[PDB]
Ligand binder design. Structure first.
Ligand SMILES: Nc1nc2c(ncn2[C@@H]2O[C@H](COP(=O)(O)OP(=O)(O)O)[C@@H](O)[C@H]2O)c(=O)[nH]1
Ligand SMILES: [Mg+2]
Length: 168
């Protein structure tokens, strides 16, 4: 069975964990420890093809990342770059995560999708047009999602898988 290692990155609080849990477990989580980084697997069918999705949900903040206990970006085949549409700071930070991915992969050609999450919220501050302009400058798809309503959730992950299949 074909395996796809996807990595979800972005600023703290944008919904990386909520997006992952919604895709895998079909439930919206109202809170999820921001320091929890883990892989979540689920068998899906995308465009008729069976595959095993391995999703690495990252913390997004060095503060949360190192908040460990008694205990990759390298192995990831595609990346979801998430901001929240009611979080201008998370959008302003997207370039940092984009540069991180290219550095850790030593490539300009990495499968990647820009995700604008929380589109169920009315207090929007990032316009769809400006997120689209940013995605065009990277040459990557832009997808609006809501981990709460499920809008765009499958589409964001499936598009990333399709970008990986295109990348061979
Ligand atoms: N209304 C709404 N809230 C969301 C959405 N996605 C995440 N949240 C909330 O945003 C907060 C942070 O989400 P979380 O997944 O922990 O963000 P993370 O730090 O990037 O993993 C949580 O309280 C979630 O319930 C969404 O699409 N819509
Ligand atoms: Mg999280």
């Amino acid at each position: 069975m074909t395996e796809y290692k996807l990595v979800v990155v972005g600023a703290g609080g944008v919904g990386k964990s909520a997006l992952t849990i919604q895709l895998i477990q079909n439930h919206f989580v109202d809170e999820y420890d921001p320091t929890i980084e883990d892989s979540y697997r689920k068998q899906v069918v995308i465009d008729g093809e069976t595959c095993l999705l391995d999703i690495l949900d990252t913390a997004g903040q060095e503060e949360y990342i190192l908040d460990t206990a008694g205990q990759y970006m390298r192995t990831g085949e595609g990346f979801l770059c998430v901001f929240a549409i009611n979080n201008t700071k998370s959008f302003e930070d997207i370039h940092h995560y984009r540069e991180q991915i290219k550095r850790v992969k030593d490539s300009e050609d990495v499968p990647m999708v820009l995700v604008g999450n929380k589109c169920d919220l009315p207090s929007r501050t990032v316009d769809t047009k400006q997120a689209q302009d940013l995605a065009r400058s990277y040459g990557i798809p832009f997808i609006e999602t809501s981990a709460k309503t499920r809008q765009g959730v499958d589409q964001a992950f499936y598009t990333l898988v399709r970008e990986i299949r295109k990348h061979k």
